[PDB]
Ligand binder design. Structure first.
Ligand SMILES: [Fe+3]
Ligand SMILES: [Fe+3]
Ligand SMILES: [Fe+3]
Ligand SMILES: [Fe+3]
Ligand SMILES: [Fe+3]
Ligand SMILES: [Fe+3]
Ligand SMILES: [Fe+3]
Ligand SMILES: [Fe+3]
Ligand SMILES: [Fe+3]
Ligand SMILES: [Fe+3]
Ligand SMILES: [Fe+3]
Ligand SMILES: [Fe+3]
Ligand SMILES: [Fe+3]
Ligand SMILES: [Fe+3]
Ligand SMILES: [Fe+3]
Ligand SMILES: [Fe+3]
Ligand SMILES: [Fe+3]
Ligand SMILES: [Fe+3]
Ligand SMILES: [Fe+3]
Ligand SMILES: [Fe+3]
Ligand SMILES: [Fe+3]
Ligand SMILES: [Fe+3]
Ligand SMILES: [Fe+3]
Ligand SMILES: [Fe+3]
Lengths: 151, 151, 151, 151, 151, 151, 151, 151, 151, 151, 151, 151
């Protein structure tokens, strides 16, 4: 019966992942900037890469005993990340820079998670969970480099 | 300004495609049948293939002048295809066989569409739209062969 | 029940395809000419290519509802193309040049077909049927170039 | 002039091979079973493999001095293997199991042959003839394992 | 004798294709912009792709009976597309944007063509002709996205 | 001299791994079920994968200072996993399902181990040891999905 | 019922093969010599190659009717080849040179076998059995070349 | 400012290269000979190879400071090689054998050039210029071997 | 502002890595031993592999907020590893065996590091830092096997 | 001491192989015919293939105990095949057709050999020796097909 | 003893190459510009390419008799190229543009060298030395195209 | 008629190349040393590489007008390199070290040649001739490194 702990949280990320997913395929479909060509391949290269993180993240669930979800009602509700309007351009000089301010929070979520995994004795979970932070961490670095350092 | 005709309908399929998408990633994540191993690879092989149909279908929009959508509110509303509960098993002997009764309707939708394209003079649209029916038609055949012929 | 129209005709080509098939593997096995080496690779490159056209052509049947045939009695009877004797050489200066005068007629058959498809509303059929004429058309051109233009 | 011995027998197998060939492309086109997906790939994987055995077997002829055949009249007559009706299903619990009871006899034919080759001093023939028994022997094993051992 | 119709027009596109060809290898050789590196690979990726469209377009001619041309006198005369001076930069804010305003017109030409093909009963011509519009249509979209939407 | 701790335990898994190894090559050689074809490839895909886990696990030993073993006397004695009789079939509805109830225990063993590694300060050991649990964990999930969830 | 002859002997080699197998993975794990790097890749290249000989050798059994074994009790008993202590070094100047004096005997065993196959009329067995002697013969040559010719 | 010397001559070859280019795609499109198949691939294999020589030759210009041309007016004027009529056949027994008598002269041009490079101290130019003579020299040899030696 | 802790230490390894780097390309360039050929490929295989460890290690810095260094003054000063003279031979029987006694210390450094990472809550750092110890640990093992075990 | 029998004969073929070798690289270097291009690739494809037959044939020697030769004095003396003058053309209508009348005799030599192997109990020798006749037999067939059947 | 001439100068370039090397891995690690993504791949694509130039350049030394260096003291002293501060941005509008003004001088150095090689009779040295100027020359062109032509 | 100069000398190297060729396949077949495995691959890697040098060197002849030779009488006579006895071992501490003292002289021959090419105005010859010295020069360096530096 045990192991609901960090499990119910997988749905937390599992949910916010498919939201960053279609926003990505949104950055990717409407984009209209000078860099274009690239910012068209690299966005694809992201949602394509968090595409693989979404399936496995889902399979961690099944690993234990849980039965993953795929419903949408439970995405546009569970996620700690919201949709992007139909924008204005590719980049965004102000605070929220989606392309930049999106991976930033999930790193916190999982950051949060890992500890509980760093407790409940689920080295298997953290092995891949914390495998993703490395994953997502570079995609953070790379982006805030399209603008400017800081943090 | 022209060309809203078959364009507004792309969103019709564009919408029902991402619904069959995550249902597929649902068949794919919970599945628990004897065939398993295979039906675990082939479902992936489907949503992976209608994944590519979803992006291009979206790019047909941008081809003309339209600006594609990626919002979810406009998927679980626009689509002529609904979500799957958390099922009961892989197959389903009764009428609706999702894995089978899903591709079946979009073929109609597009069937419908094509004519309007088969009129408005958008050979470019139909060249790929009707490129998909061939696409999806085999995936229909293949499935209703897991059960039985008919139609 | 519908769709027997262009379906019963698939068997028409489906039949004449397996006849051009083994004639090809006949040109390919006995050939004894100067070009040889090549006319030995290219014949193979043909029957290997109409090999793939034969399977799919057969799968169009199953697409709809029909159940394809594979019997021989129904090939050496249905086909609008006949066998080659044990020849005399590779080329043939007179009218019928098999290697040349074979693809020529099926283009007519299908030519004929397409219209009925270009009517019954089977864009899926024509999409691949007329996909083959392009296919077979170059293999016509290429050959009548081993001899001389005309038509 | 010599070497008609085992040569006239090549036509014996050469004939029964193209019969098992299209029956295979028959198992492959109509099949409608649960295993499906797999048994749809593996049947293809058979007739694709006895496809290569058919050409070379034909080229052994030309090796010596003989001129191979490709006519059909001489297949549905020479062969020691007959066509399959339009079946009833994929498997078959009774004696003749085509998918199983087909390779079984050619192994005898060739078995028979080899000796004559194992006499006339045609190590080149047997090197590949008996190369095929190994070939076909596993495809026998594999199949009667889909049902049950015995023999 | 027939089929001069859409044939004489192939030379129309066949001509304007080799003009967009070397202009491309012109955009590609002198370019001096910030994007550079990318716009140096993507221009190459264009003329490399319309390179393949030029040969086949030429082979459609030979398909029928016509004998393609390769002379230059008949390019800088037949084409409905003109050469680029030695420019001023990569992009161009005003109306004509070559890199953008070039594919735009051939789409019309062929658009025009197709109908006549969409009449004379040359499904083989249209199958590839209209195969190119899809081709070239995306390269239009992609470009006018380096600047701004509209149309 | 230090580091005998988790080292002597490597032999514990190192031993039970080569036992699951040949049992796998046992499931793989005698198997006779309906799924067959697949379950004949996937079993191979297992023992092939725990084949690589066996060598490296052995090389962790040499990493430190230890000299790995390869003797059999020390496998059919050290292992916490026993051999399979010559079975009865592929699957097994009762408790012990080898194909299923085998990976299950080593996960415990190592589970146990990791802690001691999660203490002695051998992050290098755990990095790969716990790299295997992820490894083996999916192969558990996958299997108990051929039957039914639970745990 | 027949064919126990050379069959019961397959187990003879089948047994001694898995013994040379783990000794190899023993030479491969402890080795500590100057050549090292190589003598570390080539040993792997051996047991990796007799790994494939072990599976097929086992499948010859199933070819006929026999049901292969995988138990260890029946390896450290049936084999005509014994385990290696934990050695002293890589090479060995005296008579028994394992790395050298191991393949040497199985060549005899099989040598012996083949005749019985070279009698019972199992060309399929010998085709691969004697396929292995060529196999193993070079690995003999290669090794006794690391030391000195002779025989 | 310097380096106009051998630079203005690059345009000399750069010009005659695009002329041999489309003549090649002319030999390649109309050809109608016995060798055909081969001479249809090898001509392609030429213009495809002098295609790469044309771009780099153009990039040598940009290397220094020059800005390459792509205009046609400056090809059918600058070149020391003229167009081919719509021929009569593939080969040509008399003096000028295009397929043969074309590479022959550019070897002279460049021959000429190199010296000036073999003077002005542009080892970088000659390194690739004289890289091309080796290039084109074999294509000379190969061709005059389709006819007869001499020179 | 936080996270200077383990960050300032990355420069510690980042520094000693480029020192082992060119010493490697030193072992690699002067080497003159019997093993040669191998020890010429394997040394390359090392510095090529710690080449990738050097860039990422540098990118961990940028991950957080730090701006990596590349200056040399800060390598031949920061590093806890010194240069090799122009040696005497490939191997070295005494204590310091560079090729062996080099990876040995960085394992300590990082060993040291990890703890601080194993505290500050930088699972992302340790995930790759401790990913390297596994990395470098085998290269230690492998080497001290070219000589003798111990430790 | 035994096994000089068929061994001294390997040198017989080993010798005549390197003679057909450089004659091939002679056919290959001077050739001047119409087929050219092909007959320039296929000759290469021969001597490249009998190149591999020459090394292994040599390694059969070392297999046993013999020490292969590589001297030339012992080729232009031992061989039962002689050099080609500097010819007159590619083909040759009369009896000896080298390109054709060369493989023809070695097939006899080995034919002869095999028996002695087919006696002395060297299944390993014959397995590859008779592996070559199949090899060389097709290259015979192929050639006498460039001219005419017969034998 | 001879050949110190151009040899002592290899160290001149060999030295300045490893300086441009880590500056490159400096442009590559800190870069923060709009182009970013591209200029992050292309810089890597440079130092990766002058990485290969550095090793071979070093191996030219060993070619003759010299024993290459790898010490750093002898780089930050021998080189005619200096380190980059921790910059300000990616590009630089003023004179020295590193990314641009770096390859520029080594071309001179080597330019200088070649002559001495173009004298001492070391065609082997110049063959690769002047192989590099072509190398580096394009990387010059490409860069000064990111800004503006000139020279 | 001209160009006999450096041409007659190609035969000089062309001759000594096929002698180093079979000596290589002699070092390669009898070798019996400790390094073995490596020195068995690297020797092959030499004669395989001077194999390609032999064909092209021969094609330089045909480039001009000359008709290459392939006779042996003209190798064991023309060459400035002699055969190796059946040796004593792999290495050789005294002066002549074949494996080492063989490439050494051809470098002189060609050295000699180049000048005459460095005169007669055959930049095409020298481009590849001096392409080989770089080739062979490294194979010199590598070998005299298996022993000791010097020269
Ligand atoms: Fe895209
Ligand atoms: Fe998945
Ligand atoms: Fe999966
Ligand atoms: Fe896309
Ligand atoms: Fe063939
Ligand atoms: Fe199929
Ligand atoms: Fe299929
Ligand atoms: Fe064939
Ligand atoms: Fe370029
Ligand atoms: Fe073409
Ligand atoms: Fe298998
Ligand atoms: Fe290993
Ligand atoms: Fe290993
Ligand atoms: Fe197997
Ligand atoms: Fe073509
Ligand atoms: Fe280019
Ligand atoms: Fe190297
Ligand atoms: Fe990097
Ligand atoms: Fe060639
Ligand atoms: Fe060899
Ligand atoms: Fe990177
Ligand atoms: Fe190197
Ligand atoms: Fe070998
Ligand atoms: Fe060649």
């Amino acid at each position: 019966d045990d192991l609901d702990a960090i499990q119910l949280k997988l749905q937390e990320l599992l949910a916010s992942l498919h939201i960053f997913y279609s926003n990505l395929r949104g950055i990717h479909w409407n984009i209209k900037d000078t860099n274009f060509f690239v910012i068209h391949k690299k966005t694809q290269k992201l949602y394509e890469y968090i595409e693989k993180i979404i399936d496995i993240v889902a399979e961690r669930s099944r690993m234990l005993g849980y039965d993953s979800e795929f419903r949408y009602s439970e995405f546009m509700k569970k996620s700690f990340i919201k949709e992007l309007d139909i924008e204005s351009t590719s980049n965004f000089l102000p605070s929220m820079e989606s392309i930049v301010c999106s991976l930033t929070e999930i790193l916190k979520n999982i950051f949060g998670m890992r500890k509980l995994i760093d407790t409940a004795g689920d080295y298997g979970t953290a092995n891949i969970m914390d495998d993703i932070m490395s994953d997502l961490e570079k995609h953070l670095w790379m982006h805030k480099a399209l603008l400017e350092n800081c943090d």
